[PDB]
């Protein structure tokens, strides 16, 4: 379930779950999939910043 939600929320910033996950790991973030989804659902602004960090790590 979590993976599905993340994929949908990560597809609103022209990105794919596989690409986002990869970037996050290279960035050094250790957030859980259950936590990542929870954030996206509520504070969407905070999620936007996270994506930026993952996009900077390519």
């Amino acid at each position: 379930l979590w993976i599905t939600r993340i994929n949908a929320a990560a597809r609103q910033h022209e990105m794919s779950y596989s690409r986002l996950m990869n970037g996050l790991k290279k960035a050094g973030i250790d957030i859980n999939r259950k936590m990542l989804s929870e954030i996206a659902i509520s504070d969407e602004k905070a999620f936007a910043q996270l994506v930026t960090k993952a996009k900077d790590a390519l």
């Binding site: 379930l1 599905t4 939600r5 949908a8 929320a9 597809r11 609103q12 259950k34 929870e38 996206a40 659902i41 509520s42 969407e44």
Partner: protein, 145 residues
């Protein structure tokens, strides 16, 4: 059971969309519409409730295929009677009643459950380019190839 948001009634917001089948592959188009109907592009997606939106195909009679699929790809159907097997080529099913050709195609990519049947009743296909749903104010939706 820690904490996981679950969508339900008086919390789900369904919108309306208008997809154009002008020069689009049957299978390639149906696949995209299916996901939208189930609502797998929503962040608050839930499997035990319906969170999908309504889709409306405008053209549908200008749908094209690849190779000799208009001559082959027959559609069989039984009538539960000894020797009651009827068939019809896809090409001949596009000339007359082309709306059923798209309906079945998009209805074959949905789960065969109680929710699956209710989710398949939110699809409206036509043959011209004028739909009688101007009161819902549906907006255009570009296909994310």
């Amino acid at each position: 059971m820690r904490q996981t948001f679950m969508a339900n009634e008086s919390n789900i917001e369904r919108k309306w969309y208008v997809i154009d089948a002008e020069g689009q592959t049957l299978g390639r188009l149906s696949s995209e519409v299916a996901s939208i109907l189930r609502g797998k592009n929503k962040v608050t997606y839930t499997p035990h409730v319906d969170t999908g939106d309504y889709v409306i195909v405008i053209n549908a009679s200008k749908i094209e295929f690849t190779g000799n699929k208009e001559t082959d790809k027959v559609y069989y159907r039984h009538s539960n009677h000894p020797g009651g097997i009827k068939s019809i080529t896809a090409g001949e099913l596009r000339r007359t009643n082309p709306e059923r050709l798209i309906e079945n195609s998009i209805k074959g990519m949905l789960p065969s459950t109680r929710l699956g049947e209710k989710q398949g009743k939110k699809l409206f296909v036509y043959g011209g380019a004028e739909h009688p749903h101007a009161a819902q104010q549906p907006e255009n939706y570009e296909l994310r190839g």
